[PDB]
Amino acid sequence: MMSREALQETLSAVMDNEADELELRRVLAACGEDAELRSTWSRYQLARSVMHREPTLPKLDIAAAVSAALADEAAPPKA
Amino acid sequence: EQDQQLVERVQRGDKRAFDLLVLKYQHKILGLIVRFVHDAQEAQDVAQEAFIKAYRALGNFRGDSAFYTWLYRIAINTAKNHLVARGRRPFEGDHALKDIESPERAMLRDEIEATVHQTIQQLPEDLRTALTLREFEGLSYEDIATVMQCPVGTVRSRIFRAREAIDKALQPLL
Numbered sequence: 611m612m613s614r615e616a617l618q619e620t621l622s623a624v625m626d627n628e629a630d631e632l633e634l635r636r637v638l639a640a641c642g643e644d645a646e647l648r649s650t651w652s653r654y655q656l657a658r659s660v661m662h663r664e665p666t667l668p669k670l671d672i673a674a675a676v677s678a679a680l681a682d683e684a685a686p687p688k689a
Numbered sequence: 690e691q692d693q694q695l696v697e698r699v700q701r702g703d704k705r706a707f708d709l710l711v712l713k714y715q716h717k718i719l720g721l722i723v724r725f726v727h728d729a730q731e732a733q734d735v736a737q738e739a740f741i742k743a744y745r746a747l748g749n750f751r752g753d754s755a756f757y758t759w760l761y762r763i764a765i766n767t768a769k770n771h772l773v774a775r776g777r778r779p780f781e782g783d784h785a786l787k788d789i790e791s792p793e794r795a796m797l798r799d800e801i802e803a804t805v806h807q808t809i810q811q812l813p814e815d816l817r818t819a820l821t822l823r824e825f826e827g828l829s830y831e832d833i834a835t836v837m838q839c840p841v842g843t844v845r846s847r848i849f850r851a852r853e854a855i856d857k858a859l860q861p862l863l
């Protein structure tokens with residue numbers, strides 16, 4: 611199994627579009643079920659925005675509510 | 690396409706990939722919306738509405754434009770329709786945010802910005818160089834590996850270690 615550290619590294623690769631296909635599937639499955647992994651992704655992206663002097667609103671979140679609303683929708687269409 | 694890998698999964702029906710894109714872009718979308726509505730709770734509501742509208746429109750996302758551009762345009766449409774329907778209530782620089790956002794949030798952002806830049810300043814050069822070539826020069830891991838004369842796996846690990854050092858400094862602040 612992938613350790614938490616290994617999955618955080620996969621998130622880092624995904625941020626750069628460098629992940630392999632299998633680890634991409636696994637890290638997404640793990641994010642669906644693990645709040646701390648989603649928060650790591652959230653904080654990695656916050657730091658990238660800070661580095662680039664882009665808008666940040668630390669600790670403000672609407673993603674949880676969006677996700678809960680989208681749980682009640684059909685999955686998005688396949689291309 | 691800055692989000693190519695998550696976009697690929699979204700176009701295969703992956704809700705988890707969309708959730709990660711919401712996490713990545715929610716602050717930019719909130720910051721855009723607040724310029725329109727000038728109210729903190731209203732901005733959150735309309736930003737949430739924009740993301741759900743984008744989700745429901747993914748059938749029309751062909752991948753011809755960047756995901757963020759497609760999302761941005763939907764947020765603009767959402768904010769416009771919101772304002773036109775609402776009517777009169779019963780945009781430059783940081784004016785809107787400074788007036789509306791929590792003063793505690795601006796203090797935290799000040800701390801976070803100083804901490805990020807101090808952590809990067811203190812990184813070993815191999816970490817800071819790999820991160821800068823990725824984040825500010827846009828180089829792929831392969832092209833960074835060529836520039837730094839190391840294996841591509843070493844680039845991947847160096848960038849990860851740089852982000853982990855930044856993250857460990859930010860975790861207590863968040």
Ligand SMILES: NC(=O)c1cccnc1
Pocket residue numbers: 667670719720723728729730732733786789790791794
């Ligand atoms: N509560 C806030 O600080 C805030 C900032 C921007 C939009 N909505 C809310």
